[PDB]
């Protein structure tokens, strides 16, 4: 409780969908942008905190709350744009005669400031007397001892709470969410989004040799002509979809109504038939 850890992760792929197939997390209250639309959102600095509290105290982890753990143990600012994850941990964090392996601070002079970890343990103070803190009644120990017994119903059981501090500040991001990778459709004009590069064309197999660091490719007219597949290292070729101009051959309305169609810039395949130059 008073020694909540902080293992900041950066420059990695964060797929939050893995947390759904885990133990039931009936505390996913994302006080932020969107809990659903979360994988398609990159983050800059994500700070993952962790602590274990009781059941009736999980509602104090929201941004802005009173109580004992939200004012002297772990207080969140009213700007937290993230998610809170908690689940019942009474299956492995509750033993006979009480689990005394979780200590929570009870007596603190002032309210805890945003993002402060009070690792020190000094005896509380009093009035006109300098209590050192041996056995004094007027003074008391700041930390207490949780009694996590399986003899308690929903509310007094341990709940491992883990939050993710999404900064979302304007800066070069490092933690980007994963994106799906559909199967490649070769020799068929479609849309492609290979590493941000958008456009349409007929993806084919090229014969040029790129350098190990060169990802994209260009031509003499500043047009993406070849890009390597991010999944499998292979040189592809980007030729745009088959377009061209149409010119109608009409012998005059006063003579007849039959017309001929000329598809300029095609080989009679990307459409009597007669191929001209």
């Amino acid at each position, epitope marked *: 409780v008073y020694a909540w850890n902080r293992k900041r992760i950066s420059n990695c792929v964060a797929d939050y969908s893995v947390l759904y197939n885990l133990a039931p997390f009936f505390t996913f209250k994302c006080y932020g942008v969107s809990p659903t639309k979360l994988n398609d959102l990159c983050f800059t600095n994500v700070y993952a905190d962790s602590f274990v509290i009781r059941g009736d105290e999980v509602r104090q982890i929201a941004p802005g709350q009173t109580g004992n753990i939200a004012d002297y143990n772990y207080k969140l600012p009213d700007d937290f744009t993230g998610c809170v994850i908690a689940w019942n941990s009474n299956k492995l964090d509750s033993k006979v005669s009480g689990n005394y392996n979780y200590l929570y601070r009870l007596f603190r002079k002032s309210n805890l400031k945003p993002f402060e970890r009070d690792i020190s343990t000094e005896i509380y103070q009093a009035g006109n007397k300098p209590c050192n803190g041996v056995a004094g009644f007027n003074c008391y120990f700041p930390l207490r001892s949780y009694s996590f*017994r399986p*003899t308690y119903g929903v509310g007094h059981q341990p709940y491992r709470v883990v939050v993710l501090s999404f900064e979302l500040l304007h800066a070069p991001a490092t933690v980007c969410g994963p994106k799906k990778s559909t199967n490649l459709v070769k020799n068929k004009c479609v849309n492609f989004n290979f590493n941000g590069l958008k456009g349409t064309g007929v993806l084919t197999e090229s014969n040029k040799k790129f350098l190990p660091f060169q990802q994209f490719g260009r031509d003499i007219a500043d047009t993406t002509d070849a890009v390597r597949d991010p999944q499998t290292l292979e040189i592809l070729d980007i030729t745009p979809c088959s377009f061209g101009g149409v010119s109608v051959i009409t012998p005059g309305t006063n003579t007849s109504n039959q017309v001929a169609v000329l598809y300029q810039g095609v080989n009679c395949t990307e459409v009597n038939v007669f191929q001209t130059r």
Partner: antibody
Amino acid sequence: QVTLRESGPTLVKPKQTLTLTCTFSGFSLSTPGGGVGWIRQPPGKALEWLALIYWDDDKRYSPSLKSSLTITKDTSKNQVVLTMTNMDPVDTATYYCARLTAADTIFDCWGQGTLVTVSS
Amino acid sequence: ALTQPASVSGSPGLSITISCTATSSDVGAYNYVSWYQQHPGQAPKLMIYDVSKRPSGVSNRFSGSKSANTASLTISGLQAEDEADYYCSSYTTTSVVFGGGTKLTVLG
């Protein structure tokens, strides 16, 4: 799978200290939520819990008997040892050591039983 | 502690229930309750823990529930290899009670 075997001298002198051990194999005691306990079963009676140890050196004993029940862990060789003093001719029973996998699974896998008949 | 019926009879094919009463239940909410089976001459093996669920290796004949404060073991489809003692166990405030015994006598 989990193999919980017992050992130690079944017959001993009265008013002594037993050394009933419980050699466990097939799992690691360092798992969070794990532990090995001890259950007594008198002939023609029901079960009764005596002691229980955990993965964080916590030794939980029965509230009735606390001056004699002393359990210890030897995970270095994987052999849980239980010691009890003041042996009276009422404790003659088949002892079992069962693994407590978690809070919901209360002693899923049990041992085989070692009868300790020591009265006179 | 926990009290259990002494003798329970059941016809082959029918279903019988056990009673694990409160008896000054210091267990509190009575969340976790496990039932064991001990044949004469063997070691007690777990049959059903967390009565809302069942462990692996146990057939669908074994099931349990707890309406308010009493856990019941519903055993359907009785056979000849079922006459054994059952024990309901929970977590008390200072120990782990195992309750009494329940002998099943399948006649016929």
